[PDB]
């Protein structure tokens, strides 16, 4: 169930052009403390199948499945420790969110579909370079705080969801919000943010598990291919 949900999540991120390459990371908190499920080393999101997700501990020992973990995902254990409510984490350097990261520009909530990130997207202004697991773990979990997402300056983004479906939903919506903002600002300059009270209400509406799960299942069907009409 978990591995199948993760495989669909990777195919959705690939379909929506996150172009994660080998810089893409995904994890789901294990029922076993101190452990997490993750895509095995050397594979991209677009090729992930349920058998490519293994269960690993703090020392990168494979507890379940066949394969070796991407050591760059070890820092996810720090986020899971700081946030008991988080059950899934995605990190990519997706094209449009990375434009915001590179220009050191926070997300400005100015449209309905940008509201799942309203008061829910942190911004790490400092780029630590090539990191260590404990260095990145400490830095990201502190900068992220209680938010669902974080733009990592000169790097990419990270989403932290209460389920793999919510982390995927946040990743897709953040990338689309970033694209919308970059295209709008190039043509028209800085955006007028929407009213905070109305944006907080749209945030909770779009983040209802029923809508998150139905949207995830829709995107999952899309990855499998739809036959044209006869």
């Amino acid at each position: 169930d978990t591995r199948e949900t993760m495989a669909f999540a990777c195919r959705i991120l690939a379909m929506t052009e996150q172009e994660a390459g080998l810089a893409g990371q995904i994890s789901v908190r294990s029922e076993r403390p101190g452990a997490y499920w993750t895509l095995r080393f050397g594979l991209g999101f677009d090729e992930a199948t349920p058998e490519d997700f293994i269960e690993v501990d703090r020392d990168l020992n494979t507890l379940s499945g066949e394969g070796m973990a991407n050591p760059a995902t070890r820092f996810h254990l720090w986020v899971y420790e700081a946030r008991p409510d988080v059950n899934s984490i995605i990190h990519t350097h997706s094209p449009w969110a990375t434009v915001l990261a590179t220009a050191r520009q926070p997300l400005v909530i100015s449209q309905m579909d940008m509201t799942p990130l309203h008061n829910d997207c942190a911004f790490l202004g400092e780029w630590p370079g090539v990191p260590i697991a404990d260095q990145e773990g400490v830095i990201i979990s502190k900068a992220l705080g209680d938010k669902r997402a974080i733009i990592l300056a000169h790097h990419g983004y990270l989403t932290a969801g209460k389920s793999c479906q919510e982390a995927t939903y946040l990743s897709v919506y953040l990338e689309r919000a970033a694209r919308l903002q970059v295209r709008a600002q190039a043509a028209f300059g800085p955006l007028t943010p929407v009213d905070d009270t109305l944006a907080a209400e749209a945030h909770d509406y779009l983040l209802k598990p029923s809508i998150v799960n139905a949207t995830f299942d829709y995107w999952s069907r899309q990855t499998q291919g739809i036959a044209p009409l006869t």
Copy 2:
């Protein structure tokens, strides 16, 4: 016949890249007063088949077909009531039209293919947030007036056609006009509008049912796939 046209209309909107999760809506005025045909809840445009369109009433009672309707489409009944000439409605948060909506920028008619929207695209400057069907329908039918289209600030757009073909035609042409304007303004600044007399003549020419229907049938063939040349 109606459901078959609506299925093709959805595949055309999907082909021309209008997805934003499950935000896409389409309806056709039923022959039964006070009722409408619409895509059942949980489905995207790209997967719609004739059997996924059900006839629903003001209380979301499925009168024909199998399924539950998207409750977000209830406001369509207010538009149909205001506009007896309108028989099909499409609402999406398509990528380029949503850039105009987010930047609070009306469409500027400066090119031949933008003319079906000449003096035919309203602009709702106020974003109501998460709406109640009572208020959304009143707000949108009032702002739309007698026009064929409306850009909904911080939200997306809506098209209102005399047929499903015309609503689809207006949707594709609005999205392409918005893309053209955003790309032109990013490189060169504000556009010079074309002469109003010539634009109104091109508007009526491009909106002739023979041209609207032939274009819709062409796009329908495209969605089915074309075999390469041998």
Copy 3:
């Protein structure tokens, strides 16, 4: 053979995202005086097969093949009359060339692949609206002069080649040159043109029939699909 070249030309324009729709036009000068070969009415470039190209006269009578011609192509006879060297004409409202057209911005030759249009792209500043065949025919052939291409303000472009291969080559290179200029100007402002003497030499190099024909045959193979490596 002529119709097979035209069928491949249409598939190439479709592959390279000219999104010609029903606004796309293509012709080849007939061996019979006062006649031309053209895509029959109601069809897009992406679906054109050799049997869809019919021979037509000044009164739109079908002399060869099955079908009715697009009456909007009648003005091509005026271009053929003004230019005995021209044997093929393509007119589309392709996405990037139409940005230049809409912003009333001539092409600025600043890169190797833009040189086939160096001193070879006219600009019609006046938009005549919905035209008459004699009106458009006289206007375009006079504005085009002895050039291979013309940007038609608020409309699109037209290419005029000594062969169908050259008209196709000019269409693809003009669309790509326009995309390059719009992207460069949005990020960095107005371009510095390359030296005219060196650009005229690159123009003649890239316009050698051997290179035009080999590039056309390459694009033709691409439209047919290439099997992945095993």
Copy 4:
């Protein structure tokens, strides 16, 4: 082995959208001095198979394989002679890197994935036009110096790798870095470069042969097509 690597490299360049007619070039230094392996004339990267790479000398004599080499690649022998450490060269006029070339804008290292080009991307400000193999070879090897890549003003780019995998990795990363910079600058103006010490460390990390080869093998699998989930 070398021919198979080159075939995959071409399919990767094609997948990552680097086409510009038949302007694409690729070579690998032969084990025989004074000779190189290259894609035979008239073929694009997307259709290359192992049998399309032939070994040729300075006079374009085919020493191995069947076919005629692209004479435009003759200048690659000058780069190989100047740089014993370089074993593969790629030259294309890819869309985004060519925007930087056309606007005479050097790459600004402001993001993690741009670091393989940190202090490793030369800029040739002078455009020589249609060149002789003679002067082109001298001009590009002098401007390239000891770097891995060079932006060629008003032309495109060239990458020079210690292996075909590294040349491919540098091309993909340069094209993506250029896209990121052009999109960021259009919306937000000039970028703030990352710290040089941290960028040099990320440069060496991302350029480790284990990472270069694993990424190349991943992209190779992607070109072959991945079946959707069941």
